[model samples]
Target: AAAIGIDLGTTYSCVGVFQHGKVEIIANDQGNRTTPSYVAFTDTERLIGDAAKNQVALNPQNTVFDAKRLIGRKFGDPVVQSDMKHWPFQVINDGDKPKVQVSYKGETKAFYPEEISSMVLTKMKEIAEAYLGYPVTNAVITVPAYFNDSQRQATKDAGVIAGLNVLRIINEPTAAAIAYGLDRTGKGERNVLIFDLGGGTFDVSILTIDDGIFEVKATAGDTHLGGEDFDNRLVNHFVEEFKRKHKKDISQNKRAVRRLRTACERAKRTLSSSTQASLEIDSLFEGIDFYTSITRARFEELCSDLFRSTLEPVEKALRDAKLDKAQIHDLVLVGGSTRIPKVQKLLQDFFNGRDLNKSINPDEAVAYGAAVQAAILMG
Candidate 1:
């Protein structure tokens, strides 16, 4: 059996294996290095990753995504209640725990957040096994640096349900630091800050790397802040526009909202590289085709508050680490959301025009570091 590394992220997941003296990110059968953290149960079969995401419009209630946000959280948590308002699926309280309810094979079924996460984890295990040509029993999984003890334990439980002998669970930013340390090859003592903004969560960690040993000094983040929030801002803006123009309210329509969300996410990604991006959806609501374009400046304006909020955690982490802004030797970007030009520019300006490190693939760095840890454990 082989040991693999898994980055069980909020919106996406990645797996990696250390082989041939290096780390190799494992691609799923569909040839994607990162798999969507989605699971759907249809009448006849269960779907994961791309397949699950593809049918979201048709089965929005049954397709589960963003399970990471609900895992280990109580139903009464204010954060959970706020997130539930936006979800198409139903979440019921089962003895204080949040239970997701879905229709499966003609029967109504309820599941814990860990179960949904395990389904995604199982898919990652299968993908790794397929690529490595062997069963993978041992794994090292990465979680958000700000995850609490209960959240970490819930993640480990998911791995156990997925049939993996979880060797270790490491923080996402720390794993990223490991990947960077290995890549540097020649490293002395240096202070590094990892800014990770994924689809559903944000985390900032300040650490010191000394002779290949990485030590975390402080961590800060908002579990509810991420790229998904940015997309929601754009979605809300357009929803209002549509109501004013067509006098139709699509906010209460699950399918229409989902479609708009997808469009907004795509446009957000486009705005990362281009000055303007267009969002269009055919038959968005009541046979109305929605089309609109927004400039990079407008997008930044919409998310200006969110962009500023990220810096708060950075400052908190730096203060806790007892390090000045000038003392940070390297600033590593470690999530897909970090690709946004606005985010990069703000961080660079905050660091007095220092270049942020982007050598590691933001999507796969945690998995790569997990694989490195797996290799070490085996040795």
Candidate 2:
């Protein structure tokens, strides 16, 4: 019951139970369906989920999430600082490194890559260990196939800091292709394209599945672009609207801006299911009321840059493999953002009348794939 696989994803982390040749997802203590890719600390408790997420309204300074973007890069990378511009928490100049600092109670603490990832992995391990009623000590982790040596090493370090023996680091889209490949295979060769758009990174993979062998032909993605970044954009828009309405700017005020950013993100999640969502972050500044209405269409427009930005790799994946889009036998979509309407439409349009195979559960496929790897590891 304890033999598990961890996705260790950028936005969300999932643990899969490889029992009886099937994958079972275990819920954490907070009764959440999934763990938030966020961490926050209070004087009394180490918050990890919705509780930690909920506190972002005024305490963005204390909530630390999305550490996945910083684990592999040098301290002086422009991409790191560019990404940090919109974040509510304080990322200070640690000489050259972009480091996260969170205030707990009255104390402010500087964090390392290991501390952030360990908090998350520790949560997953506890879930597995509790359900098995035994110590669970091993994991099969998935990272982007295109990750360089530094990225791979950082991920392995995360496992060690979290105290789990990481069995292997399989490519993420490659992992998904394997999950799908196991369920259905044809007589001849099959060429599949995996479009993985997760919380903090986007990866497109072209893989070949012949008979039972799965081989990756090419992979490409940007580590800095994902759902969370999109959320930050919407948050920025809200701040702009607040300025227009109140005739004042609050973006410079950390705590006030943090609260509104939280409100904006909450509405983003709501808009995912409904056509329109409301936001009311009153007194966001000193005696200023902030309100905005967001629609699905507006959300689509706001995400256009990201959607457009992601297409190059999708095309590059085919180009790198020396195959045209039409040559791909199956176009499979993975990651939570794939569930977005615009993401689905863009992929379908980009495929030039080709259809995307949406059979895999966007939320569960990666974990399910990792579990298959876990079973493979045991023998």
Candidate 3:
């Protein structure tokens, strides 16, 4: 049996396999390389990926999102408390740990975050099984470099619960770096930096590559920072604008926040390339019209602190590795957030004209690397 590599991200997930001595990404039933990390419950059935994300607006209360943030945490953890404020679904205490309580398929039940994650993993397994036209029982998974031991174990447990043999768990940045290092000759050595800003996490790692051998020098990141935060910055801007116009604060309304989230994500992507983006939602928030135009300048200004925050970790990684910035040979970019113009500009300008690596698909690199490792292991 062959193995697959899975990048189980917060906002999105992907699966890839290595066969015929090449890595290939496997699309889900939706025919998408990246699937939304969302789960929704209906009266009679359950939904995952795109199907679940589609109903998030209509059934906000029943959709479980950001569960990865709550995974492996106690009920009383400060981070879990903070997650309560941002998540639209219900998060409840199940004795010592946190559990998600949702009316899935007409029954209100509580599910551990690991169980929810397992659901996602199972879907990915199904995708791989279908694509390979064979049973896939072993796999490699990627997680954030900042993930603690508990989180790492919880992820391994997720893979087990999904009925896959969890071969290994690799750090996000390290996996991407491996993909880049794999192509180089072993005699040639390079010190490379990886800048990974994904949907829900930001991390940087410095690695030394000698031929085919890869060694991680240092890694740093803020798990709570990523593309979602950028979208939230815009969403908060809209909420304030709406309150000013209507004399109301609709932050308490889950549906309004959900719609605004979708709009903000779109606007965030638009502003990455264009100067401005217009956001609108009809009959939003108790039938009040919601519309606004956000200039890229305004968005950048609002998120300047966040943009700047990423640099500290970069410097820390360099310091920990005892590597000078000038000594870096290549800077690899991973994750969808790296596509943002401002994010790229900040890194490029900081590196003094060093070009960002774009040889791999930002969204699929981690999974691809995971697949490459799986291929190695099968040998």
Best TM-score among the predictions, by candidate number: 1
As a TM-score, model 1 comes out at: 0.90
When summed lDDT is taken over every stretch of 10 residues in candidate 3, the lowest stretch is 177-186
lDDT string, candidate 2, 276-318, tens digits: 9998876778877777799989988987888888899987778
RMSD of 2: 3.5
Q: Taking the tens digit of each residue's C-alpha lDDT, what string does model 3 give over 281-346?
A: 898888888878999899999899998888889989999999888988989888888888888888
Question: Which residue pairs of candidate 1 clash?
Answer: none
Off by over 4 Å in 2: 42-45, 60-62, 72-111, 130-134, 182-188, 287-292
Backbone atom clashes (below 3 Å) for every candidate: 0, 1, 1
Writing each residue's lDDT as its tens digit, candidate 1 over 1-379 gives 5699999998999999998888999889889899999999888888999899988988989999989989989999997999999888999999999989999988899999999999999999999989988888999998877678989999999999999999999988778878876335456768889999888888898878776676889989887788989999999999999999999989999789888999999899899889999987899999999999988899999999999889989999999999999999878898888988999999999888997888677878889889998888888
Which whole-number lDDT from 0 to 100 does residue 160 have in model 3? Answer: 97
| lDDT of every model, 2 decimals | 0.89, 0.77, 0.86
Best by lDDT: 1
lDDT against true structure, model 3:
0.86
